[PDB]
Amino acid sequence: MDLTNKNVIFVAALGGIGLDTSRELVKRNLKNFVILDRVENPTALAELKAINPKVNITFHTYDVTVPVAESKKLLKKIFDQLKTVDILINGAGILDDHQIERTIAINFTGLVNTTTAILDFWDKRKGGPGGIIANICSVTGFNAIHQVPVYSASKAAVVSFTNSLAKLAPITGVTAYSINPGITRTPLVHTFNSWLDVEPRVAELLLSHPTQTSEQCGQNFVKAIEANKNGAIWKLDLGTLEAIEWTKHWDSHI
Amino acid sequence: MDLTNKNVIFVAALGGIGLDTSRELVKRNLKNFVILDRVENPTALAELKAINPKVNITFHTYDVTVPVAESKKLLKKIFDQLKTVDILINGAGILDDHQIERTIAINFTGLVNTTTAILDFWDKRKGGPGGIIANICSVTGFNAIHQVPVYSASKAAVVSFTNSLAKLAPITGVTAYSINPGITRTPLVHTFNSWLDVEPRVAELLLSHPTQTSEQCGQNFVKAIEANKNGAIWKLDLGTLEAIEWTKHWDSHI
Ligand SMILES: NC(=O)c1ccc[n+]([C@@H]2O[C@H](COP(=O)([O-])OP(=O)(O)OC[C@H]3O[C@@H](n4cnc5c(N)ncnc54)[C@H](O)[C@@H]3O)[C@@H](O)[C@H]2O)c1
Ligand SMILES: NC(=O)c1ccc[n+]([C@@H]2O[C@H](COP(=O)([O-])OP(=O)(O)OC[C@H]3O[C@@H](n4cnc5c(N)ncnc54)[C@H](O)[C@@H]3O)[C@@H](O)[C@H]2O)c1
C-alpha cells in the first residue's frame, strides 16, 4: 500500500498510539485523513496540519458505542463526500476492568459494529469496491494480562474477528489485518483497574518490565499498513514489527 | 473431583450438550444439581429427576444478560439453601450472527458476569471457601468458523477469560478450566445465521465433515470435570478428550 493519495478513516486517531500513528500517516501524503473520535482535540489537529499541509484533514465526533445505524449514517456521509475510502483503522479502546460492560462494548462490540457498518459501502456483493481494515487489537489477545481478564478477553475477541474478516475477503472484497502492540507508554497503562481488584499494583508492575514508546509503535504501525497483508497478525513490541503464525488447533473444514 | 455428594450449579443445563452432560452428572450421585436456564423444559427436567431420584434437582429461571447485582441475588438464594456450592458450570450460548449485541451479551458478557457474581460468595479474600468454574467455550475460540465471526470471537473471548481465571486462583481461591466442544450433533448447529449472510448454509456445510455425538461429548465433559485440572483447556472433538497447550506468543512478565 503506497499511502500517497489515499483516503483513510481512523477511529480513535487522537489517543496515545493513535496520535503517534497519525503523525506518521500524514507524513505519507494521504489525500484525505478522516479522524473519528469521541472528543475533538484542536491541538493535535494543528499538529497534524503542521506536519503536512498537503493532506486534507477532517474531524467527526464519533462514539463506537452508538448503534450500527448511527455508524452507517456517519459513514454514508463520509463516503458520499470522498466518493472512495481506501483504509479503515479501528482504534478505540479502554482499559478498566471495573467497567465490564463498557470494556466489552468499546473494545469488541464497537469494532464489530463499525466494521459491519462500513461493509454497506464496501461489500462487493452490494456493488462496492472492497477495502482494507486495520484493527488495533493487542498482544493481550494472544496471551492475557490475567489481572485484567476482561480487557484481555475483549482483545482475544477482536484478534479472532480480524482473522475471520481476512478469510471472508474473497466474498466481501474487504481485507483485514490486526495490529497488536505490546506494552506502550500511553495514558491507557499508567494507572488502571484490575478485575475485582485482584492486583491494585497492576500498572506499576507491568511498567517495571521493558516497554516501547508510542513513537516506535506508530512508526511500525504505518510500516504494517504499507505491507498490506490480508490476514497478517502483526506484533508491535519492544520497537519491532513481527508477523506471528496463528496456531491451528482446530479446523472447521469449511 | 469426586462428584459424590457435591453441589453443582449448571447454567444452561437442558440444551443440546448440557442435557447429555447433565445425564452423566446426575448418574454420579450429586447431592444437589441446580439448573439455571432461560427457558423451562419440563420433559427434560422430568427425565433427569428420574435418573437418580436421590439427587435433589432444582430449576430456576435465569437470564445471563441481567446485571451482576441480579445474578448475586439469585446466587444468594441458592447459597442460603445449599450453604455450599462446589462447581459452577457456565454453559449459556447462542449462535446467530444476525444478533451481534445479543451474541456478545450472552456468550461473553453474561459468562463474565455470572463468574463475577459467584466470586462474591467464593472469593477467599472475603473469607469464602474458593470454588471451581467450568466454562463451556468452543473450539471456535481457538480457530474460528469464520462465517460466524461474531460467535467465534465471543468464544475466543471466553477461552481467554477462563485462562486468566485459572491464573488468578492463587488470589481468589477459584480454579477454572474450559470445555471446548467440536462440532456435535445437537440443534444449535441446525440452521443458523452467518454474519452479513456470507454463507447461508453453514450448518449443512459443518455437518459435511466428521463430527461427534452429544452423548460422546457429555461423557468426555464429565471426565474433564472429574480430572479437575486448573487452567486446563479441554478439546472435546471427534469423540475424544484432549488437553491443549496454549501457544505462548507474548508474556506480560507479571
Ligand atoms: N498502550 C498499550 O500498551 C496498548 C497495547 C496494545 C493495544 N492497545 C490498544 O491501542 C488502542 C489505543 O490505546 P492507547 O494506548 O493509545 O490508549 P489511549 O487511552 O491513549 O487512547 C484510547 C483511544 O480510544 C478512543 N476511545 C475510547 N473510547 C472510545 C469510544 N467510546 N468511542 C470512540 N473512541 C473511543 C479514545 O478517544 C482514544 O483515541 C486501544 O485499542 C488499546 O486497547 C494499547
Ligand atoms: N453444538 C456445538 O456443536 C457446539 C460446539 C462448541 C461449543 N458449543 C457451546 O455449547 C454450549 C451449548 O450448546 P448446544 O449445542 O447445547 O446449544 P443449544 O442451543 O442446544 O443450548 C443452548 C443453551 O444455552 C441456553 N441459553 C441461551 N440463552 C441464554 C440466556 N440468555 N440465559 C441463560 N441461558 C441461555 C439455552 O437455554 C440452552 O440451555 C453453548 O455455549 C455453545 O455455544 C456448542
In angstroms, the CA B101 to CA A42 distance is 34
Taking the CA of residue B43 and the nearest CA in chain A, the distance in Å comes to: 33
**Interacting residues of B230 by C-beta distance below 8 A, sequence separation 6+:** B166, B169, B175, B176, B177
Query: Which among A114, A117, A198 is positioned nearest to A151, based on CA atoms?
Result: A198
- Among all chains, which residue has been given the C-alpha cell 469464520? B146
Q: Taking CA atoms, what residue in B is nearest to A253?
A: B209
Return the residue of B nearest to A199 by Cα: B171
Documented resolution in Å: 1.1
If one counts the domains in chain B, the total is: 1
Interface test with B, best of A160, A167, A194, A240 (most B CBs within 10 A): A160
Subunit contact B209:A147, Cβ cutoff 8 A: no
> All 3 cell numbers of residue B236?
472435546
Q: Do the Cβ atoms of A130 and A124 come closer than 8 Å?
A: yes
- b/e sequence A69-84, b meaning 16+ C-beta within 10 Å: eebbebbeebbeebee
Q: In residues, how long is chain A?
A: 254
Identify which of A94, A97, A109 to mutate to test ligand 1's pocket (most ligand atoms within 8 A of the CB). A94
Active-site residues of B, by number, are 151
The answer to whether the beta carbons of residues B88 and B114 sit under 8 Å apart is yes
Number of the ligand closest to the Cα of B41: 2
Q: Any bridge partners for residue A57, and if so which?
A: A33
Interface of B with A in 189-208 (CB under 8 A): 195-196, 198-199, 202, 205-206, 208
* Contact status of A154 with chain B (Cβ, < 8 Å): yes
Q: Do A250 and B143 touch (CB under 8 A)?
A: yes
The residue whose CA is least distant from atom 35 of ligand 1 is A92
Pick A161's closest partner by Cβ from B116, B119, B149.
Answer: B149
User: Whole-angstrom Cα distance, residue B131 to residue A64?
Assistant: 37
Pairwise CA distance, residues A18 & A222, whole Å? 11
What residues are in contact with ligand 2 under a 6 Å CB criterion? B 12, 14-18, 37-39, 62-65, 91-94, 106, 136, 138, 181, 183-184, 186-189
A198 vs B154, B155, B172: nearest CB: B172
Residue A49 burial by Cβ neighbours in a 10 Å radius (0-12, 13-18, 19+):
middle
Residues of chain A contacting residue B199, judged by C-beta atoms under 8 Å apart: 171, 254
Take atom 42 of ligand 1 and give the residue whose Cα is closest: A93
In angstroms, what is the span from residue B120 Cα to ligand 2's centroid? Answer: 25
CA distance A158 to A115: 11
Task: Residue A154: list chain B partners with CB under 8 A.
Answer: 157
Whether residues B253 and A209 touch (CB distance < 8 A) is answered with yes
- Give dist(CA A239, CA A216) in Å, integer: 5
B156 close contact with A: CB closer than 8 A: yes
Q: Kind of pairing, strands A240-243 and A233-237? A: antiparallel
For residue B88, what are the contacts with CB-CB under 8 A and spacing of at least 6? B8, B9, B11, B114, B115, B118, B131, B132, B133, B134
Is residue A112 within 8 A of residue A128, CB to CB? The reply is no
Residue B76 to residue B118: CA distance in whole angstroms: 9
CA–CA gap between residue A163 and residue A146 (Å, rounded): 23
Within 10 A of B70 (CB to CB), how many other CB atoms are there? 14
Secondary structure, 3-state, chain A = CCCCCCEEEEECCCCHHHHHHHHHHHHCCCCEEEEEECCCCHHHHHHHHHHCCCCEEEEEECCCCCCHHHHHHHHHHHHHHHCCCCEEEECCCCCCCCCHHHHHHHHHHHHHHHHHHHHHHHCHHHCCCCEEEEEECCHHHCCCCCCCHHHHHHHHHHHHHHHHHHHHHHHHCEEEEEEEECCEECHHHHCCCCHHHCCCCHHHHHCCCCCEEHHHHHHHHHHHHHHCCCCCEEEEECCEEEECCCCCCCCCCC
Distance CA A105, CA A120 (A): 21
Phi, psi dihedral angles at A123 (to 5 degrees): -55, 125
Closest to A240 in 3D by CA, of A181, A193, A196, A198:
A181
Q: How far lies B107's CA from each of A103, A114, B41, B141, B167, in Å?
A: 15, 20, 21, 11, 21
User: How far, in Å, CA of A74 to CA of A96, rounded?
Assistant: 28
* CATH number of the domain that residue A243 is part of: 3.40.50.720
Query: How many Å apart are CA A99 and CA B236, to the nearest integer?
Result: 33
Calculate Rg over the CA atoms of chain A: 17
Neighbours of A104 (CB within 10 A): 24
A227 labelled binding-site residue:
no
Q: Which of residues 19-78 of A touch B (CB under 8 A)?
A: 68
> Buried b vs exposed e over B218-233: b needs ≥16 C-beta within 10 Å?
bbbbbebbeeeeebbb
Inform me whether the C-beta atom of residue A239 falls under 8 Å from chain B C-beta atoms.
no
Cβ distance of B100 and A112 shorter than 8 Å: yes
B12 CA → ligand 2 middle, Å: 7
Its domain, for residue A76, covers 1-254
Tell me which residue of A184, A183, A167 sits closest to A175, measured CA to CA.
A167
